[PDB]
Amino acid sequence: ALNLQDKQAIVAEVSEVAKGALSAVVADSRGVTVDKMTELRKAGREAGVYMRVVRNTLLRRAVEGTPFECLKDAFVGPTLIAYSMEHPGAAARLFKEFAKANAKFEVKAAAFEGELIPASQIDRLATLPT
């Protein structure tokens, strides 16, 4: 579908950054639907459907919604990447679940470089409000 729908999904992603927080990377070059029922069943464990893995990191798609929100994520653009925003519980445990899940039979996970709360890099952090 044309501009209306691409731009629609993108702006919808932008609205999820307006009330978002911590985020992380994930790149399942060889993923399975079985893992769909792990991180997303985890989404169901958090609250509901709202969480969007929205794997669409085209430099003119997901990165296109970048100049209006979190421009530091522009360097995350290259290769297969799926951004993971949050909403309930600031700096929640959704981040560590990528690192632990990757070691939990999932081949790979974009080298778990993470995204933006301290504007940092690949850092395994249990240092989250618990």
Partner RNA sequence: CCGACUUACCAACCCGAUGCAAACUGCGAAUACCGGAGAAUGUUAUCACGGGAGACACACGGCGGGUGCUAACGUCCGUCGUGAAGAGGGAAACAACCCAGACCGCCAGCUAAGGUCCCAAAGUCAUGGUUAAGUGGGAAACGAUGUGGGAAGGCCCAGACAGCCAGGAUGUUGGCUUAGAAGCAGCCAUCAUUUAAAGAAAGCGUAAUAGCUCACUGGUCGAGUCGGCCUGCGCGGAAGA
Partner RNA sequence: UCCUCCUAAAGAGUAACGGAGGAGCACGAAGGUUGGCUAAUCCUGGUCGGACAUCAGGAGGUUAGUGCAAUGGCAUAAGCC
Partner RNA sequence: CGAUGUCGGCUCAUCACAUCCUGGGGCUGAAGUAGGUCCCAAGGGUAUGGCUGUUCGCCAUUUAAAGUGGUACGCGAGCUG
Chain residues binding RNA by CB under 7 A are 1-3, 6-7, 10, 28-33, 36-37, 39-44, 48-49, 51-62, 64, 78-82
| Smaller CB separation from RNA, 46 or 128 | 46
Report the sign of the C-alpha dihedral through residues 26, 27, 33, 35, in that order: negative
Q: Are residues 88 and 19 in contact, defined by beta-carbon separation less than 8 angstroms?
A: no
- CA atoms of 130 and 20, how far apart (whole Å): 18
Rounded to a whole number of angstroms, the minimum distance from the CB of residue 92 to RNA is 15
Q: How far is the CB of 54 from RNA (least distance, A)?
A: 5
- Smallest distance from the beta carbon of 22 to RNA, in angstroms? 17
Identity of the residue, 3 or 130, whose beta carbon is nearer to RNA in the bound complex: 3
For residues 84 and 51, what is the distance between their CA atoms, to the nearest angstrom? Answer: 7
